[PDB]
């Protein structure tokens, strides 16, 4: 049995959010789904669970009267709903599975956590950072683009465009600025280009070096001179 | 060429504050600015504040001000960075990174691109929570580990209902440990579990490499309270 969750989610404080985990093994009606959640470098927090035969479902006492889980079972998918979101919300959201058929029909939400999902991120922040494709992947020699588009303001003329690669553990370094222009030793295996509202980066000729995160960067060309950033895309080369 | 040197990982309570500095080891500190970026683990980039060493002057963004100012000292070269009323939420890695400055005279523009960046300084704010694991545990190959949890006589003292959790990152929790002492299939039996008054325990034996990862417990909250209750988690490294 596999649990697929929605994709990641990018919300602004004060609205709410729908995460779904549909299961790919039948006899819905035998589990419980439980949603656990985890804060980026923090621990596992339980919110409630739901049992499809009964119709119930319970909440921790923190979430009580912002979560409401539901269960569909003509397509075998549980649903979660956070309401009220604010800054400390952000996290990765997981749904697991408990058999009843092992653990009894009495003691559940108990803690018998088998299969998981893979994880649903979600975002919540006043300043929203500019909107990158999660992730990208790409066999060597091939070319790939990665474009930064402005989200709730958007990019313009007036906007300084940097690119920035970062591999696990170290620090970012500087891919491109000016929007096209490539600092001293980076090679012309990297491009970019800005055009209206989006900003693109190219690399060709991949090789596994290659490999890592990037992010866009936007400065000045608004009425509050400030940075911003793109939330990341992850880069795959496959060898 | 020029190197930015930042100070050592820090462990704060949340409602305290906590000061990074970033060290210039070569060229003069009047002609650039210097930024700090922070990013969560797994997370993004987030711009943070500035200052120009000159000017004396530091600009935060909306979200840190009134909990985040940056000064310097032009005679060791340092930058320094102070956020106060600290909460979970700020548990991230802090970078300072150099902006070019230019000017005209009495107007000053700067570059918008930075190089170069610190190598980062992590800061861990957490909490305690409702069972108490030793926040990180150090074995070599072969020998033996146990990391203990502790909670009240409502969830491990009253039940025994308790699982353990292995969670590699980037990857989902992994059970490897339920009813305080069964293993589930496909897990080696290097992994065992106990159970006494209040507290629970895993053992690894024969610790592989692989075995370097988070392991959360948890417990049946009582039947007065539905649900489950999670260990902070514990932080496993093998010295190879």
């Known amino acids: 049995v596999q649990l697929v969750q929605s994709g990641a989610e990018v919300k602004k404080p004060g609205s709410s959010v729908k995460v779904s985990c549909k299961a790919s093994?039948?006899?819905?009606?035998?589990?419980?789904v439980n949603w656990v959640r985890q804060a980026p470098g923090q621990g596992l927090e339980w919110m409630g669970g739901?049992?499809?035969?009964?119709?119930?479902?319970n909440y921790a006492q923190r979430f009580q009267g912002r979560l409401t889980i539901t269960a569909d079972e003509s397509t075998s998918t549980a649903y979660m709903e956070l309401s009220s979101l604010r800054s400390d919300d952000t996290a990765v959201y997981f749904c697991?599975?408990?058999?009843?058929?092992?653990?009894?029909?009495?003691?559940?939400?108990?803690?018998?956590?088998?299969?998981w999902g893979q994880g649903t991120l979600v975002t919540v922040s006043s300043q929203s950072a500019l909107t990158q494709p999660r992730s990208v992947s790409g066999s060597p020699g091939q070319s790939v683009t990665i474009s930064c588009?402005?989200?709730?303001?958007?990019?313009?003329?007036?906007?300084?465009?940097?690119?920035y690669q970062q591999h696990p553990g170290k620090a970012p370094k500087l891919?491109?600025?000016?929007?096209?222009?490539?600092?001293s030793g980076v090679p012309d295996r990297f491009s970019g280009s800005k055009s209206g509202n989006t900003a693109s980066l190219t690399i060709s000729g991949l090789q596994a070096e290659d490999e890592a995160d990037?992010?866009?960067?936007?400065?000045?060309?608004?009425?509050?001179?400030?940075?911003?950033?793109?939330?990341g895309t992850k880069l795959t080369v496959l060898g | 060429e020029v190197q930015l040197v930042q100070s050592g990982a820090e462990v704060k309570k949340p409602g305290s504050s906590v000061k990074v500095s970033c060290?210039?080891?070569?060229?003069?500190?009047?002609?650039?600015?210097?930024?700090?970026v922070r990013q969560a683990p797994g997370q993004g980039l987030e711009w943070?504040?500035?200052?120009?060493?000159?000017?004396?002057?530091?600009?935060?963004?909306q979200r840190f001000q009134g909990r985040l100012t940056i000064t310097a000292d032009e005679s060791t070269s340092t930058a320094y960075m102070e956020l106060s009323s600290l909460r979970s939420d700020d548990t991230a890695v802090?970078?300072?990174?150099?902006?070019?400055?230019?000017?005209?005279?009495?107007?000053?523009?700067?570059?918008?691109?930075?190089?170069?960046?610190?190598?980062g300084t992590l800061v861990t704010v957490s909490s305690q929570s409702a069972l108490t694991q030793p926040r990180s545990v150090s074995g070599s190959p072969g020998q033996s580990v146990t990391i203990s949890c502790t909670g009240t006589?409502?969830?491990?003292?009253?039940?025994?209902?308790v699982s353990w959790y292995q969670q590699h990152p980037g990857k989902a929790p992994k059970l490897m440990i339920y009813?305080?002492?069964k293993r589930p299939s496909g897990v080696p039996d290097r992994f065992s579990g106990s159970k006494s008054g209040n507290t629970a325990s895993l053992t690894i034996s024969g610790l592989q490499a692989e075995d370097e990862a988070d392991y959360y417990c948890?417990?049946?909250?009582?039947?007065?309270?539905?649900?489950?209750?999670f260990g902070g988690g514990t932080k496993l490294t093998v010295l190879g």
């Open positions: 948890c417990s049946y909250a009582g039947d007065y309270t539905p649900g489950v209750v």
């Open positions: 006589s409502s969830d491990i003292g009253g039940y025994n209902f």
């Open positions: 093994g039948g006899t819905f009606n035998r589990y419980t």
């Open positions: 739901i049992i499809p035969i009964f119709g119930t479902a």
């Open positions: 697991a599975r408990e058999n009843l058929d092992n653990s009894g029909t009495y003691y559940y939400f108990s803690g018998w956590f088998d299969p």
């Open positions: 009813d305080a002492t």
